[PDB]
Amino acid sequence: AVVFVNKLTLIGDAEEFESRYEAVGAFMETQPGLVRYSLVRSTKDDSVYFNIAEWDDEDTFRKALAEPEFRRRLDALTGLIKGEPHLSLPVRQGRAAQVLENLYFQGHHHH
Amino acid sequence: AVVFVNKLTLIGDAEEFESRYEAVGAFMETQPGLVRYSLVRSTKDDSVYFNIAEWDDEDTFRKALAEPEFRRRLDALTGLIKGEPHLSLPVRQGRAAQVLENLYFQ
């Protein structure tokens, strides 16, 4: 898996930016290789967002990025945000299933 | 849910940073409210990492950070990285959908 992380700086209207991002996320949802994505907004500095997307691999991320209609919805955000994008590799991970498993094992093993 | 994002800049040895971060990840996994976390390293600028940690709510995140053991293991990263921390609220999210989803008319 690869994890796309874009640190966004809001330079326009927050509500307009977020509604337009909706169409980007909608499109990503049936792009091959997309696992999940989240747009999150900092509570410390509300001009700071992060676009975070997990992809099966680098090749599927590459092929999705090139799709004209995806790029059209992405381009509709230019002028509302500036981006500092990072295609990134997982280095250490606490998977949800494993976090849950360690909890219920400690509680139900009765060591 | 809330998503903590820390943009980390490496200022020492990457291998030791990553080994010492193992202890931080381990302790997080024992704390009430943790959903999941990933530490990822940028392939554009390899001095950049992001810690991305998902918690049930701000409350559980704040309560975990009040643990002395958590603070001890964070303090062991001093000199290896610098942080830009952001507790963040999900604004939009989704996951892989079925291409045929709308053709059931359910």
Which residue's entry shows tokens 């909890």? A103
Contact A71/B at CB under 8 A: no
Residue A110, both tokens: 């009765």
Residue A41's SS3 state is strand
For chain A, state the CA radius of gyration.
Answer: 17
H-type alpha helices, B1-106: 14-29, 58-65, 68-75
Which has the closest alpha carbon to A73: A21, A4, A33? A21
CA distance A31 to A73: 14
Residue A72: alpha-carbon gap to chain centroid: 18
Q: What angle (nearest 5°) sits at the alpha carbon of residue A45, between those of residues A24 and B18?
A: 80
Residue A95, both tokens: 């998977």
CB contact under 8 A, A7 and B3: no
CB contact under 8 A, A52 and B49: no
Residue of A nearest to B37 (CA): A94
Domains and CATH numbers, chain A: 2-109 (3.30.70.100)
Query: How would you class A63 by CB atoms within 10 Å of its CB: exposed for 0-12, middle for 13-18, buried for 19 or more?
Result: middle
Query: Do B70 and B31 contact (CB within 8 A), yes or no?
Result: yes
CB contact under 8 A, B5 and A40: yes
- One-letter identity of residue A24: V
Query: How would you class A108 by CB atoms within 10 Å of its CB: exposed for 0-12, middle for 13-18, buried for 19 or more?
Result: exposed
For chain A, give me the number of helices (H) and strands (E)?
Answer: 4, 4
